[PDB]
Design a protein around this ligand. Sequence first.
Ligand SMILES: Fc1ccccc1NCc1cc[nH]n1
Length: 460
Amino acid sequence: QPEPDMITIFIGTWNMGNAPPPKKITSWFLSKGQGKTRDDSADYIPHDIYVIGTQEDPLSEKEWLEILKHSLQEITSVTFKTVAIHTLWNIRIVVLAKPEHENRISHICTDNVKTGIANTLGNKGAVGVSFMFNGTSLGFVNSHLTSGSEKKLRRNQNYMNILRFLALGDKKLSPFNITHRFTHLFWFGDLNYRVDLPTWEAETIIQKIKQQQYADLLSHDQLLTERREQKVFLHFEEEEITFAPTYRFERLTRDKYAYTKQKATGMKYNLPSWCDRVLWKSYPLVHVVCQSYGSTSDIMTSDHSPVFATFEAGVTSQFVSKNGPGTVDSQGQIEFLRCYATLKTKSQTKFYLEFHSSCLESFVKSQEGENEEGSEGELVVKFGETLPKLKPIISDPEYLLDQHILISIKSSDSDESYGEGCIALRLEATETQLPIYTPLTHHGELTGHFQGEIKLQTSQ
Ligand SMILES: Fc1ccccc1NCc1cc[nH]n1
């Protein structure tokens, strides 16, 4: 039985509004309703992995797992295996996989982050799951961020706390946060960003939704505008939104948005908004294609509609050669020529690099770079031709060209990372000097750039 080079992944996010679900929720897992929906001809084809994020979930883990498994079995006839389940308060993530994947999945991690302080600590935060699928690392984050139209900055802060403190994936990747630890990272949930239009325009917005005219609403969506201004979710992707706002509905219909201020809302307006979202970030030049992104129309127990997204995702096999794992393959090498980091820092420490990759036996520390002043104020750290030659465990180009090198630039004085990035080895040529580039981030904010040339030697 061949190992796959693609899988499909289902991502669901649903704020259940503290109410039990209806008896049938199959439309969610079938990607049917509004938006980019899945073709009927695929309905019996199971996804490889289903990742379900809930918020305001009133069920026990047992109760929800029974509903989810029975739903998938009804659709597909397949009895899915439970990979992981993790709950923080009423925020939950479930990962289910086809039984044939059970011996492909390993290194399962779970964690949570509680956001806020005192007043604002006790119900918002995130849960996550990571694991290896053969040679490919997968991370999943379900976050319930701060509510309210006038709290976009708090949401952005919540995002930065979650990506700093959620402890998933390979702990040896110590300079790297979750935005660099995974081949594919999916971040979803009740992100709670709102359509920023005046309260007086509520009925106009409702009109627009009834006409399926979302352009003048999406142009005011806080997540899209904050992302455009590089305030949040830097280097993440989101599929175009083609479904109606998923909040805030009257329960038991989808015919009415309930936006007016009430004691139950803290006297806040809830204008129709795309609270419920799926974003992703994959390593450079890895296959990832969104094949659905939409909301259900027929699940009406909550004041939110469920959101689905599905993806094709490239995966790699657990490679064995005569040599690596457990030695190097001297027919393989990675050279960095004429490299330099450009940093936004005002500091004047010396810097060194660390190169981290599962194609290396362990991470590699460089010599200190040479600091120069850039024309427009910046720090330029030059490495010249001084960088250590990297010795991969396997030289086979079918393996090596699919790998990635994580780079951290660290202060000699403090050993703290000032920036992290990633270089693909999916080159146009081997034995050829080729340009490389990554932005550098720290705590998910832009801190600089790394650029230079690479020369990759494979066994071919
Ligand atoms: F979210 C982004 C990342 C990169 C470039 C652009 C965007 N959003 C554009 C937008 C703003 C309001 N509606 N659409």
